[PDB]
Tab-separated table of C-alpha atoms in Angstrom:
chain	number	residue	atom	x	y	z
A	1	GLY	CA	-16.505	-5.766	-14.683
A	2	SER	CA	-13.527	-7.412	-13.001
A	3	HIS	CA	-10.958	-5.390	-14.947
A	4	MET	CA	-10.504	-8.119	-17.559
A	5	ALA	CA	-11.352	-7.100	-21.124
A	6	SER	CA	-8.046	-8.037	-22.754
A	7	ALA	CA	-9.245	-11.569	-23.494
A	8	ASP	CA	-12.530	-10.021	-24.626
A	9	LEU	CA	-10.981	-7.656	-27.171
A	10	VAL	CA	-8.625	-10.326	-28.509
A	11	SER	CA	-11.187	-13.136	-28.590
A	12	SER	CA	-13.732	-10.779	-30.148
A	13	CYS	CA	-11.399	-9.124	-32.656
A	14	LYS	CA	-9.906	-12.502	-33.564
A	15	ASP	CA	-13.214	-14.359	-33.838
A	16	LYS	CA	-14.576	-11.643	-36.127
A	17	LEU	CA	-11.358	-10.978	-38.046
A	18	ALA	CA	-11.113	-14.715	-38.704
A	19	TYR	CA	-14.781	-15.053	-39.651
A	20	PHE	CA	-14.291	-12.046	-41.927
A	21	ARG	CA	-12.714	-12.428	-45.367
A	22	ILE	CA	-9.280	-10.963	-46.094
A	23	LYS	CA	-11.165	-7.688	-46.528
A	24	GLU	CA	-11.215	-7.218	-42.753
A	25	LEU	CA	-7.462	-7.747	-42.417
A	26	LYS	CA	-6.959	-5.600	-45.516
A	27	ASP	CA	-8.509	-2.515	-43.921
A	28	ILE	CA	-6.727	-3.202	-40.632
A	29	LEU	CA	-3.268	-3.778	-42.106
A	30	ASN	CA	-3.963	-0.866	-44.453
A	31	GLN	CA	-4.461	1.641	-41.636
A	32	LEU	CA	-1.557	0.146	-39.684
A	33	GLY	CA	0.774	0.756	-42.612
A	34	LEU	CA	1.589	-2.827	-43.571
A	35	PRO	CA	2.813	-3.925	-47.028
A	36	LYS	CA	0.563	-5.296	-49.771
A	37	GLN	CA	1.927	-8.739	-48.903
A	38	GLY	CA	0.949	-10.851	-45.909
A	39	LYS	CA	-1.088	-14.018	-46.398
A	40	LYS	CA	-4.253	-14.693	-44.399
A	41	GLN	CA	-2.049	-16.155	-41.665
A	42	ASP	CA	0.521	-13.352	-41.670
A	43	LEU	CA	-2.225	-10.736	-41.384
A	44	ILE	CA	-4.166	-12.596	-38.695
A	45	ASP	CA	-1.009	-13.045	-36.624
A	46	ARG	CA	-0.246	-9.358	-37.160
A	47	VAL	CA	-3.611	-8.144	-35.866
A	48	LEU	CA	-3.605	-10.324	-32.750
A	49	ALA	CA	0.062	-9.497	-32.169
A	50	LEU	CA	-0.847	-5.819	-32.504
A	51	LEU	CA	-3.654	-5.843	-29.936
A	52	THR	CA	-1.678	-8.281	-27.787
A	53	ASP	CA	1.996	-7.390	-28.195
A	54	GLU	CA	1.112	-3.790	-29.048
A	55	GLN	CA	-1.993	-3.310	-26.904
A	56	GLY	CA	-0.281	-0.121	-25.774
A	57	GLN	CA	-2.479	-0.314	-22.685
A	58	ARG	CA	0.342	1.455	-20.846
A	59	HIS	CA	1.539	3.581	-23.766
A	60	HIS	CA	-1.341	5.805	-24.877
A	61	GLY	CA	-1.466	9.494	-25.746
A	62	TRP	CA	-1.612	9.801	-29.527
A	63	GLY	CA	-5.064	10.400	-30.975
A	64	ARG	CA	-3.659	11.366	-34.367
A	65	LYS	CA	-2.192	7.883	-34.802
A	66	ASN	CA	-4.684	5.542	-33.135
A	67	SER	CA	-5.458	4.083	-36.562
A	68	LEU	CA	-3.183	1.220	-35.515
A	69	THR	CA	-4.779	0.557	-32.127
A	70	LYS	CA	-7.688	-1.480	-30.767
A	71	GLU	CA	-9.989	1.429	-31.612
A	72	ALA	CA	-9.104	1.089	-35.296
A	73	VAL	CA	-9.278	-2.709	-35.424
A	74	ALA	CA	-12.603	-2.639	-33.581
A	75	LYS	CA	-13.865	0.139	-35.849
A	76	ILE	CA	-13.373	-1.892	-39.027
A	77	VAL	CA	-14.518	-5.199	-37.539
A	78	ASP	CA	-17.671	-3.463	-36.314
A	79	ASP	CA	-18.406	-1.925	-39.714
A	80	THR	CA	-18.015	-5.365	-41.287
A	81	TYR	CA	-20.374	-7.012	-38.801
A	82	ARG	CA	-23.105	-4.377	-39.052
A	83	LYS	CA	-22.665	-4.292	-42.830
A	84	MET	CA	-22.589	-8.092	-42.992
A	85	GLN	CA	-25.967	-8.753	-41.372
A	86	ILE	CA	-26.364	-5.833	-38.968
A	87	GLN	CA	-27.137	-8.103	-36.016
A	88	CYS	CA	-27.291	-6.722	-32.475
A	89	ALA	CA	-23.639	-5.666	-32.351
A	90	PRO	CA	-20.794	-8.180	-31.879
A	91	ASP	CA	-20.489	-6.887	-28.316
A	92	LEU	CA	-16.886	-5.860	-28.979
A	93	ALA	CA	-17.036	-3.646	-25.890
A	94	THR	CA	-19.581	-0.886	-26.496
A	95	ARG	CA	-17.074	1.551	-25.001
A	96	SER	CA	-18.238	0.212	-21.636
A	97	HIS	CA	-14.782	-0.134	-20.086
A	98	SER	CA	-12.355	2.790	-20.280
A	99	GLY	CA	-11.782	5.611	-22.746
A	100	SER	CA	-14.451	7.971	-24.056
A	101	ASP	CA	-12.592	11.259	-24.500
A	102	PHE	CA	-9.928	10.139	-26.975
A	103	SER	CA	-12.448	9.126	-29.638
A	104	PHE	CA	-13.838	11.041	-32.617
A	105	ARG	CA	-10.472	11.013	-34.388
A	106	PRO	CA	-9.836	13.689	-37.050
A	107	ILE	CA	-10.005	13.252	-40.825
A	108	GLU	CA	-6.323	13.784	-41.614
A	109	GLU	CA	-7.110	17.483	-42.021
A	110	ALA	CA	-8.529	16.592	-45.436
C-alpha cells in the first residue's frame, strides 16, 4: 500500500467494536487488564485510545505481553465477526502489512 494502515486498523477495530455488543469490549479490556467498570463509552474510548495513543508502532518488542496491542484487539474482533456470521473476513488487515514473526503468542505456560 501507501504505508497508511493506521486509519484502517482504527476505523476497522472501531467500526466492529462499536457494532459488537459490550462482549467485544469485555474481552479486549479483559486482556488489557482494565477494571470491571467502564461503561460502553469508557471502554470504546479506551480501545481506540489504546490503538491510537498506545499504538506502540515505535515501541514494540514484547511478545509475552501483546495481549494489549492491536494484535489482541484484532484477534477478538475477528473471532466475533467470524462467529457472528462468518462472512468473508472484516478485512482487518490479513497480516498484509508488517509483522509475521511476532505472532503465535504462547499460552501463559499453562
